[PDB]
Amino acid sequence: KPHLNLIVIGHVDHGKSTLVGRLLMDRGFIDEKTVKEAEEAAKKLGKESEKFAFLLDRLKEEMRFETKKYFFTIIDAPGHRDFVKNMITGASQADAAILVVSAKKGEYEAGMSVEGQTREHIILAKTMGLDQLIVAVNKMDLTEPPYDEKRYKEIVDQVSKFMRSYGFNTNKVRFVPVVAPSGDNITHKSENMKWYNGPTLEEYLDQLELPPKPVDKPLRIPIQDVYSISGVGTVPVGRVESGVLKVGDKIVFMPAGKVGEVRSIETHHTKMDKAEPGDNIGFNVRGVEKKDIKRGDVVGHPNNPPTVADEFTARIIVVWHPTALANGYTPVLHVHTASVACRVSELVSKLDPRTGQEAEKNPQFLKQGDVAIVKFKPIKPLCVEKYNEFPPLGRFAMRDMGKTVGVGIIVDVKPA
Numbered sequence: 001k002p003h004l005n006l007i008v009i010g011h012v013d014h015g016k017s018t019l020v021g022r023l024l025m026d027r028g029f030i031d032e033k034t035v036k037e038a039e040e041a042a043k044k045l046g047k048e049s050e051k052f053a054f055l056l057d058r059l060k061e062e063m064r065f066e067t068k069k070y071f072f073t074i075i076d077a078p079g080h081r082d083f084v085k086n087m088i089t090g091a092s093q094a095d096a097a098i099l100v101v102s103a104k105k106g107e108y109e110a111g112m113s114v115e116g117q118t119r120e121h122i123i124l125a126k127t128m129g130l131d132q133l134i135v136a137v138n139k140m141d142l143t144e145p146p147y148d149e150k151r152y153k154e155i156v157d158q159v160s161k162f163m164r165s166y167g168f169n170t171n172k173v174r175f176v177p178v179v180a181p182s183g184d185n186i187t188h189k190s191e192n193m194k195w196y197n198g199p200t201l202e203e204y205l206d207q208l209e210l211p212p213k214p215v216d217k218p219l220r221i222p223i224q225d226v227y228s229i230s231g232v233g234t235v236p237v238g239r240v241e242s243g244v245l246k247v248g249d250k251i252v253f254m255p256a257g258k259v260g261e262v263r264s265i266e267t268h269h270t271k272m273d274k275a276e277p278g279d280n281i282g283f284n285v286r287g288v289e290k291k292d293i294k295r296g297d298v299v300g301h302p303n304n305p306p307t308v309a310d311e312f313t314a315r316i317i318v319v320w321h322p323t324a325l326a327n328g329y330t331p332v333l334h335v336h337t338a339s340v341a342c343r344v345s346e347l348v349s350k351l352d353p354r355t356g357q358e359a360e361k362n363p364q365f366l367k368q369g370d371v372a373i374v375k376f377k378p379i380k381p382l383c384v385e386k387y388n389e390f391p392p393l394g395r396f397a398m399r400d401m402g403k404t405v406g407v408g409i410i411v412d413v414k415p416a
């Protein structure tokens with residue numbers, strides 16, 4: 001079973017911890033010593049729900065669960081220390097999300113208001129590429145009257161329209177009416193909402209689609225070295241990061257834009273007919289002057305040439321800087337196999353480190369610890385890609401004085 005990292009978002013008090021606690025209790029792996037004590041507590045109080053309350057407190061004291069198809073690990077949601085930094089560095093990363101929305105009168109409205117976190121987290125989920133969001137419309141037992149279809153539809157309609165207005169796709173968004181404390185429509189079908197005829201939240205989690213595999217994405221091969229072999233020809237070497245290279249393929253070298261044909265491929269001094277992601281290969285290319293090939297360049301197929309950036313926008317964490325950095329700062333960026341000086345061309349905004357939202361627009365400077373959106377202009381043509389399109393070519397380190405000054409993920413490229 002594939003492992004996925006899941007983030008649960010939503011407004012304060014809407015039911016996130018409870019829902020998380022319910023999933024862990026019903027499909028997770030709580031230690032025997034903890035389960036036991038929880039059962040003991042429920043026994044002494046003569047109330048079954050005391051078990052869940054006991055477990056919730058234990059969990060809070062401190063997170064993987066299993067469904068029909070997947071293994072899920074619950075990770076930090078916005079509001080936590082290093083939330084943004086960990087997503088940028090790749091220390092954490094969300095594969096799927098559940099937005100918890102309270103159906104209780106007033107709560108739903110507060111969450112969806114201008115300053116509310118339901119609206120904030122939906123926009124954040126859009127920035128994170130969480131197109132398969134599952135929206136749990138929770139506290140269905142607290143509508144007036146309890147389990148009200150009309151209130152659930154109103155919420156589903158309003159949230160859906162809001163999402164559409166933010167580009168947030170929608171055909172992959174699923175809504176389910178639930179009650180977190182009891183697991184109703186979460187880990188079992190509710191007997192209280194006969195009007196709902198859709199999948200349970202766990203069933204929606206099992207409907208999640210895994211992202212495209214590198215082998216099915218366009219070819220990208222960052223070049224690590226290039227040699228000239230007498231009587232053989234030009235032989236670049238690099239690791240396939242996405243796509244498939246095959247003997248006979250026409251390929252293009254960027255940034256130069258030169259086209260050549262692959263005559264052979266080898267890995268480990270062994271000829272192969274095809275190379276797939278992960279394969280470190282030497283490949284003989286006919287038609288290209290070695291002077292148009294260098295370490296840092298990137299190969300692709302002519303129909304999908306590697307992107308070359310005139311400018312790019314990134315979300316960065318400044319991990320180390322002794323004073324302050326400003327517009328014009330020009331460190332060396334290391335991205336895939338390239339090492340190129342890139343000038344900071346705009347400090348777009350600093351971000352709140354716990355949430356990802358904008359905090360100061362156009363700051364004069366960034367200091368160590370800051371997270372920000374920044375634009376860079378490579379001093380010479382540089383191949384890069386958006387992180388959410390080709391990860392291996394979209395995360396970089398800013399280096400200076402032998403140290404990593406910062407790490408960033410690329411979120412936009414102005415092609416050359």
Ligand SMILES: Nc1nc2c(ncn2[C@@H]2O[C@H](COP(=O)(O)OP(=O)(O)O)[C@@H](O)[C@H]2O)c(=O)[nH]1
Binds near residue numbers: 139142181
């Ligand atoms: N009646 C009812 N209470 C709920 C439900 N979900 C959560 N709660 C309660 O509402 C409060 C807020 O929930 P909490 O999970 O801590 O949400 P959080 O701030 O989003 O993590 C808790 O005190 C729960 O007991 C629900 O579906 N029905």
Ligand SMILES: [Mg+2]
Binds near residue numbers: 016017018
């Ligand atoms: Mg909570």
